[PDB]
Amino acid sequence: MTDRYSFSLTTFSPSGKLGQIDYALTAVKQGVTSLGIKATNGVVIATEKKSSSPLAMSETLSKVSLLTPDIGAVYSGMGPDYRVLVDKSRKVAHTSYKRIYGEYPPTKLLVSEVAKIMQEATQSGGVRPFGVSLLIAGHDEFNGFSLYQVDPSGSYFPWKATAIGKGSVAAKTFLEKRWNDELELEDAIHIALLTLKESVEGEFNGDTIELAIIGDENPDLLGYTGIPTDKGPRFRKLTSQEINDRLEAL
Amino acid sequence: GSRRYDSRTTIFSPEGRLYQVEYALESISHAGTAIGIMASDGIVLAAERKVTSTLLEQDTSTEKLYKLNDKIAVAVAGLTADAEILINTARIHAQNYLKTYNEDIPVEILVRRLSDIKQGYTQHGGLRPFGVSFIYAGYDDRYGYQLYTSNPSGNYTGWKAISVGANTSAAQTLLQMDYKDDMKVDDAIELALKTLSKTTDSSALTYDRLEFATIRKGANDGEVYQKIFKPQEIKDILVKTGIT
Amino acid sequence: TGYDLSNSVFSPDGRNFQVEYAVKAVENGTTSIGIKCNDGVVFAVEKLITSKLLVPQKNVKIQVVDRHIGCVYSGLIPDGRHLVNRGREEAASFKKLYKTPIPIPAFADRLGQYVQAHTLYNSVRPFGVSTIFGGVDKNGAHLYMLEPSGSYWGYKGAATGKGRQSAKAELEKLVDHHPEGLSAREAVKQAAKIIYLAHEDNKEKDFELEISWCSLSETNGLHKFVKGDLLQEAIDFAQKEIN
Amino acid sequence: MDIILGIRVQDSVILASSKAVTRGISVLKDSDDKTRQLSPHTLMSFAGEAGDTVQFAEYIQANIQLYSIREDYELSPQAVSSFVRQELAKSIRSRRPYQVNVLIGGYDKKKNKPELYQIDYLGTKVELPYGAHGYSGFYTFSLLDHHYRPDMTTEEGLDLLKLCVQELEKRMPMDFKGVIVKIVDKDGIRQVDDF
Amino acid sequence: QFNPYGDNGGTILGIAGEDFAVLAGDTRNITDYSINSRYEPKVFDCGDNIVMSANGFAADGDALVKRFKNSVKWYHFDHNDKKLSINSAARNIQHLLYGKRFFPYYVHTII
Amino acid sequence: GYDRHITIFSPEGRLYQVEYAFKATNQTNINSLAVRGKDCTVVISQKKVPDKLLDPTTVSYIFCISRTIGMVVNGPIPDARNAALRAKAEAAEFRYKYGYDMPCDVLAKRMANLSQIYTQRAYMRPLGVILTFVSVDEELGPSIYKTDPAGYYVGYKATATGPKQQEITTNLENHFKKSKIDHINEESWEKVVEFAITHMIDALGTEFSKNDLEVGVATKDKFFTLSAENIEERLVAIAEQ
Amino acid sequence: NNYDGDTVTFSPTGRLFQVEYALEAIKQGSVTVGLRSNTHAVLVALKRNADELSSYQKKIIKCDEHMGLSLAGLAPDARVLSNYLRQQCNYSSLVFNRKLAVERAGHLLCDKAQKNTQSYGGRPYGVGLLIIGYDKSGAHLLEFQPSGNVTELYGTAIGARSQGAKTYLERTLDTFIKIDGNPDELIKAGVEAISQSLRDESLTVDNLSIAIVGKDTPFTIYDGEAVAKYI
Amino acid sequence: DRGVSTFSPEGRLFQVEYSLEAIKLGSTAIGIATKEGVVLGVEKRATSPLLESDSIEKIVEIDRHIGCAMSGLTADARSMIEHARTAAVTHNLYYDEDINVESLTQSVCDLALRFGELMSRPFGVALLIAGHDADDGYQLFHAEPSGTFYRYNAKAIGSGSEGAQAELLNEWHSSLTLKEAELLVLKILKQVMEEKLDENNAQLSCITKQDGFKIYDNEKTAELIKELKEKEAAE
Amino acid sequence: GYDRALSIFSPDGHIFQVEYALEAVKRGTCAVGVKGKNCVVLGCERRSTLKLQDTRITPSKVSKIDSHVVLSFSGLNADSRILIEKARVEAQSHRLTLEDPVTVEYLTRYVAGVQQRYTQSGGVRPFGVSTLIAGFDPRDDEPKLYQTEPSGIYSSWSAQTIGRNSKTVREFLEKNYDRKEPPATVEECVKLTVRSLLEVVQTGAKNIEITVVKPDSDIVALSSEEINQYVTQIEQEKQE
Ligand SMILES: [Cl-]
């Protein structure tokens, strides 16, 4: 018994390709479209909620996840792989940062830790790479707002705006025409909804779309009062009703 | 058992070559070119970003050039994720040395240890090697300015000028042509940019597809300064030499 | 293909061919049975007499676990012994922690989980035995049969080995003809008959009969081997029925 | 063990170390050299628990010699002293700590300066113009506070050292059987045979 | 606090002649002021014409004799039934005893 | 083609061992169904006992994980019991560590995470089972959460699993289109069980005796399975209407 | 064919080829015979040499004062298994002051061999053993196969051409079982048994190996001039 | 590929059988046992004339009463000799006596099958272990990577073994003197060796009760070579 | 831990991984060792496809193991660092326990033992390196030259070469080296070493390295001009 697979399952081919990473990226291509747009006073991340059955309650399945009060994540590819990555990402923000410095990590460093985890699944013994690409949006005091993409290889890149998954090629082109460096958060949400409608086929409403923002602090979502320096989470998930309000003036 | 699925990453070919090392070098040859040039009064590091998109955030980005300590930096060619694993190890190793001896680590010692780690992955453990080649640029009070390179085999060598990644054959011929020993930093800056501009697979070399850095003694009296160039500074240096 | 070369690999059907190959080793083995009765269980097995040189009564195949459970198996005999050794460890640790002797359903799952674990990895081989076992606990009598996959159920009667189909048919007749129940002493006699009837599928070499039983009234809820007068009486009953 | 002294002057570091090895009511040896050359321009003297002293000294010696061969280069006195301090700082929280006190005298060839470091068994390091371990310091520090000048020659340093040994031979309870004196300068390490 | 040692009393005596040797010992076994047994032998034939007694704390004494007797058995198994000479037995017993140098067998041994 | 033997990616980004584990799910040829009432959650499954020598009382694919949580399995019994024992241990540990009963959805996530590991780690095969967890959660109310060999999980208004799952699924969809609500608007669990059996009969097109079915019911503070006579009592009520 | 790469793989007909190949190593081994009465048990073994300059490979090993075995196949594997038996016999004596029953000795060997047939990396033992002994229930003879199967017998034989001796003992069963209180006659029967497995070679003084254990006889081995009596 | 500890269909371990082929490629080593002592001789076989032949060490001391000769992958023998020496000295420490030659050989042979998936492969070297003890007198053993050892009156191993063994079959008798054995090893080595035999490319040694294990000088062997050539010409 | 037996026997009795490691040695740059009456000289080839090199900082081909012993090699450069490091550590460890520096034979025996261990240990491949180890034993004036190889065998040589085209330079040394009269001086020994490399090298510019070891820890490396003088002198005598 015991894990006898102590050798790498991802190896270089004669042409120099890393097969399993390429195949993992192919799995991401099949995945449902998700996107992210960076505004001057915030960031928006969005995706379609592909329901497996109409009897399924799609509210119980969250594709957009809070990692820290100021950082959120969305993905394209294999859902189960994403779910466990969110668990590990939430924990590493505490163990390797908050328990040391008494504050949450800046976006770039949390992204760096997730990237490390995904790189190790590319080299360690007896494992396949993660079959997901992540988009991580966040805010911190010294870097302001930022948006990152993390791929199965463990590589990460900062973006002004981007899309991943099914119709990413067309969605990226759409975002290039609309994005400028003066966009306000509400303008970015509007463009996000426009871009997503192109890739969505069936119903397009607040129940089939999942969307969250990184913006102003929300004292009402903190849960307590009395500490002036603690002002609340910048991450907020838009409600089904809040999405439909913006779909009328579309 | 599991024998069936073992690729055997650490074996010899009949010709006496290491399959996985050779294939990792083939991977690196498709990565963006990086150039190091050593002058008498400093070192230049220049690297080409891999085909950029217009919506990429250029200023808050790091892909090619990384800081190991205040006196040493590296240019990367290969898998970025693999490079960051090794960079963090190298950063820790430098601090271990400083903690032990109360002196900044000599460049070669850091390079040897990082190269020894790469070597290990080719001889034991059954894991794939790191698909990364480094250009090390640094200064210490023994040898002064130094350029090194290491590759997946764990072999390292010292250079006056060197390139890694794509089009090294063409790049090395151009560097070998115009380099001379009494060269200054500002001349080396020009040579680096001119070489990339001729070897690039792109249509034209622009500020948004480059990372740049210098290691001079151009601080105030007998001390070394690392300058990782900002986007606007690369735009200016590209105009100053008349490439754009 | 090649899906059958490694344990724990799913074929495109959703099957583990290595387990199905272990079943073939069980089908090759000698016949063994189990009969559930009024207040207990009876076990019997066919022992092929390969040579005159085998010492009679001295190659015992039925095994006891704890003091209240009996186990018999068909297929690779060493594999069966390994399973019983584990069963004895499982029963010992249960009694150690909980004081009471291990219940039969509890014991059945302990073997089941252990056998199932040998279908999860390619570094182990599945068990080459089907095991019939049972006994008496606080809730009465229980009979079980466990297969290489880890699959087990409760049984009114059970059979495995080369003469399983012959024995099954004979078992089904007893269930139909006795809806109220079969007595312990009757089940011993019937067990002898069924082994003799199931021997027709292995009739080159002649055989030696071995029986054991647990009964609340007859053996006081403990596992005992059937020997001497009670054994010869059961053999004679079986001899009369084949002719 | 017992008496180890050190004096840094203009161009050299001078170490003096007692020759006696006593166990119980018997002086077992009167010519013991309580020092090891770590590198051509670095010398370490030691005192403390029996066995521990030599074992530690030789362990440090082996490590510095290993470093020298690997890099084809001599570590600075400051670098060696920091390495030694860290080893003792590790040791003090071990199952059985090294009970060894050391002085490190070295000549830095890059700076062209003598350097004297005092390190105790806890890993307490200080750079000093003059140093001592054990009860010796209770006499020599005040003496050197009075007579020491920073610009003295090697000969002036040896006379200053004679004054310390004389004071110790007068007021110390135990017979330490004189000292072995060694000089560390630009030309390396040499022993004074007539002291 | 638990004391792992005890004193079982008794005394033993060995004398060697030209072509013979004797090993004697009393048969009394005690704890404190009480008699445990009037006949409890502590001189044993260990095979290969070697007699042995380990007197002091009887539990350690019995353990040692038991281990040496076993050592003779394995000496035969490993070295083609060769006879264990008295000098080789002596050296073997030294290693049995010194093996527990930091938790000793509390006995005085004679062979 | 060793990429079809262990859980690594194929050139088209697929995991064939996970896909073949899904096909093992239907090996038993049994269909299950789960629905929610106002106060309860009902799960029903077919019970096929082909051999006459079997003790029918020991043939079951419904498990009592905790006092509040029940679980029905679609797949081979060895893997089913493996999953059940782990779920029981996990639910027990949760209560000990965190001082309250493990919610149905949290246990579903935990078992889904374990399943995900088998899809990523090579030495462990996936379990060829689909696990349907049911309860009346103290916060969320009546709950149905389902796990598969891919490590996927989600909550359901109602659900079905097995070879003829699609027929049952659409049958339920059409009812909830009509009723316009998320559940069975009924007071007693007895009539929710009757609804479950009725709609399974219509979808599968077969009649059931008392021994052809297996029923599990979750109410506030307990999950329990029904006896043959409890089901017979339920079958009589359907027939007399 | 495709299913003989290791012991952890079953064939499509439910066979373990590595175990069968281990069984084959026994068939190539030199013949050895075992037989018993009610008072004594006897091993007889034909020893094999490399050439006329070499010694004759010893086949019989003592495990305790009351137990021992003979070997056919890989001799180092017999050394490992006999050493295990020596330890188990010894554990029983030191801990329980009890001579290990010959039946338990068989059960212990079975379980040790079995573990090597179900795990990856290992291999089956490549040797067969005939264990004789005298315990609280009289004389015994066991046959060990590296598949794990252990069998108690009145008499048997393993190795090359063992079928000749096995047939002879099957005929002689009623005679030799009642040779009680007579060691030399029980050996004579065993020496006549092993003679039915000889081809072109005959029993010489440095070729024959005999062992005996019984009621008032510790397990002892006879070689060299001590077996000249029986030729 | 396939397991390292795999059986062939004929009931033999592949790796053990393959290591036996490696030993056949090795240089010749011969041993002869007499009542006056045991002689051990080897072919040195230098690959090039520039190689200093006296550095070729294929005969080796284990203890004062036990010596050893090797053939095959001779680098593999180093850890076997190290074990043998430690086993011999350790036994003297535990028992205040010399260890039996057979017990030493058995201890070395216990290492042999300690390979698999312990070391990664069997040893690729065969050993001739010669010695004396009080119980069984002068002895010669052939230790193989199978874990098996035979006692021999005389034995040859290496490339010229089957030809040399057939020669030893005819020449050996139970009354050979030590001098007769010395000449016999030289004679048979000269027959099977490729290059012409002399004191630089062949080495002799012996073990006697009185003087223990001794490797002969090149001067001493040269005279035995000259004595051998003269005796063959003398009839 | 990774356990795979990578070095195993084949049907013909060869260990292919050990033999393929010898091919890596054959690919490496040529290295030669010649010992005189009172010295040993180690010569090394450096390939000239690499211009723009920095020779101050580039790892030298001959490494000091202790102040009295040196080690050169042919084969994988990265592999050689591991052997050199282990050798240097053993050198200091020997001085510490025995209170005497290693003999050249002992240091060689250790390095060879390490190489052998990597041929029958699980999860590792053999070293793709052969070494020449030269020096003088403590308080001894007799020159010592040893060779090791991936299999683990080692031996003493009057003169030896390893690496690419080593069979050509071995041929040269076999007819030009007299056992009865080794190079009597330092000059004679260096010249014979340079001559032997000139059979294979190309230009005698920055392609040849020479290191001379004399008794009592007297080791020095020759510069370009010093070596170039031997190259110039040899060519003028050749035109005859
Ligand atoms: Cl989890």
UniProtKB/Swiss-Prot annotation, chain B:
SMART domains: Proteasome_A_N. SUPFAM superfamilies: N-terminal nucleophile aminohydrolases (Ntn hydrolases) (SSF56235). Gene3D superfamilies: Glutamine Phosphoribosylpyrophosphate, subunit 1, domain 1. There is a cross-link at K99, K198, K230 (Glycyl lysine isopeptide (Lys-Gly) (interchain with G-Cter in ubiquitin)). It comes from the Eukaryota. GO terms for cellular component: cytosol; nucleus; proteasome complex; proteasome core complex, alpha-subunit complex; proteasome storage granule. It is found in: Cytoplasm; Nucleus. Keywords: Cytoplasm, Isopeptide bond, Nucleus, Proteasome, Ubl conjugation. Its main location: cytoplasm. Disulfide bonds: none annotated. InterPro entries: Ntn_hydrolases_N, Proteasome_alpha, Proteasome_alpha-type, Proteasome_asu_N, Proteasome_bsu_CS, Proteasome_sua/b. GO terms for biological process: proteasomal ubiquitin-independent protein catabolic process; proteasome core complex assembly; proteasome-mediated ubiquitin-dependent protein catabolic process. It holds the Pfam family Proteasome. Present with 17100 molecules/cell in log phase SD medium. The proteasome degrades poly-ubiquitinated proteins in the cytoplasm and in the nucleus. It is essential for the regulated turnover of proteins and for the removal of misfolded proteins. The proteasome is a multicatalytic proteinase complex that is characterized by its ability to cleave peptides with Arg, Phe, Tyr, Leu, and Glu adjacent to the leaving group at neutral or slightly basic pH. It has an ATP-dependent proteolytic activity. Belongs to the peptidase T1A family. This is Proteasome subunit alpha type-3. The gene is PRE9.
Swiss-Prot record, chain F:
There is a cross-link at K222 (Glycyl lysine isopeptide (Lys-Gly) (interchain with G-Cter in ubiquitin)). Keywords: Acetylation, Cytoplasm, Isopeptide bond, Nucleus, Phosphoprotein, Proteasome, Ubl conjugation. GO terms for cellular component: mitochondrion; nucleus; proteasome complex; proteasome core complex, alpha-subunit complex. Pfam families: Proteasome (PF00227), Proteasome_A_N (PF10584). The modification Phosphoserine is found at S227. It is found in: Cytoplasm; Nucleus. It comes from the Eukaryota. One of its GO terms (biological process) is proteasomal ubiquitin-independent protein catabolic process. SMART domains: Proteasome_A_N (SM00948). Present with 15200 molecules/cell in log phase SD medium. The proteasome degrades poly-ubiquitinated proteins in the cytoplasm and in the nucleus. It is essential for the regulated turnover of proteins and for the removal of misfolded proteins. The proteasome is a multicatalytic proteinase complex that is characterized by its ability to cleave peptides with Arg, Phe, Tyr, Leu, and Glu adjacent to the leaving group at neutral or slightly basic pH. It has an ATP-dependent proteolytic activity. This is Proteasome subunit alpha type-1. It comes from Saccharomyces cerevisiae (strain ATCC 204508 / S288c) (Baker's yeast). The gene is SCL1.
From Swiss-Prot, chain G:
InterPro entries: Ntn_hydrolases_N, Proteasome_alpha, Proteasome_alpha-type, Proteasome_asu_N, Proteasome_sua/b. One of its GO terms (biological process) is proteasome-mediated ubiquitin-dependent protein catabolic process. Gene3D superfamilies: Glutamine Phosphoribosylpyrophosphate, subunit 1, domain 1. It comes from the Eukaryota. One of its GO terms (cellular component) is proteasome core complex, alpha-subunit complex. It is found in: Cytoplasm; Nucleus. There is a cross-link at K188 (Glycyl lysine isopeptide (Lys-Gly) (interchain with G-Cter in ubiquitin)). The keyword Mitochondrion does not apply. The modification Phosphoserine is found at S11. Keywords: Cytoplasm, Isopeptide bond, Nucleus, Phosphoprotein, Proteasome, Ubl conjugation. The proteasome degrades poly-ubiquitinated proteins in the cytoplasm and in the nucleus. It is essential for the regulated turnover of proteins and for the removal of misfolded proteins. The proteasome is a multicatalytic proteinase complex that is characterized by its ability to cleave peptides with Arg, Phe, Tyr, Leu, and Glu adjacent to the leaving group at neutral or slightly basic pH. It has an ATP-dependent proteolytic activity. Present with 7210 molecules/cell in log phase SD medium. Belongs to the peptidase T1A family. This is Proteasome subunit alpha type-6. The lineage of its organism: Eukaryota, Fungi, Dikarya, Ascomycota, Saccharomycotina. The gene is PRE5.
Curated annotation (Swiss-Prot), chain H:
Keywords: Cytoplasm, Nucleus, Phosphoprotein, Proteasome. Coiled coil: none annotated. GO terms for cellular component: nucleus; proteasome complex; proteasome core complex, alpha-subunit complex; proteasome storage granule. Its main location: cytoplasm. The keyword Cell membrane does not apply. The keyword Nucleus applies. The modification Phosphoserine is found at S48. The 26S proteasome consists of a 20S proteasome core and two 19S regulatory subunits. The 20S proteasome core is composed of 28 subunits that are arranged in four stacked rings, resulting in a barrel-shaped structure. The two end rings are each formed by seven alpha subunits, and the two central rings are each formed by seven beta subunits. The catalytic chamber with the active sites is on the inside of the barrel. The gene is PUP2. InterPro entries: Ntn_hydrolases_N (IPR029055), Proteasome_alpha (IPR050115), Proteasome_alpha-type (IPR023332), Proteasome_alpha_type_5 (IPR033812), Proteasome_asu_N (IPR000426), Proteasome_sua/b (IPR001353). The proteasome degrades poly-ubiquitinated proteins in the cytoplasm and in the nucleus. It is essential for the regulated turnover of proteins and for the removal of misfolded proteins. The proteasome is a multicatalytic proteinase complex that is characterized by its ability to cleave peptides with Arg, Phe, Tyr, Leu, and Glu adjacent to the leaving group at neutral or slightly basic pH. It has an ATP-dependent proteolytic activity.
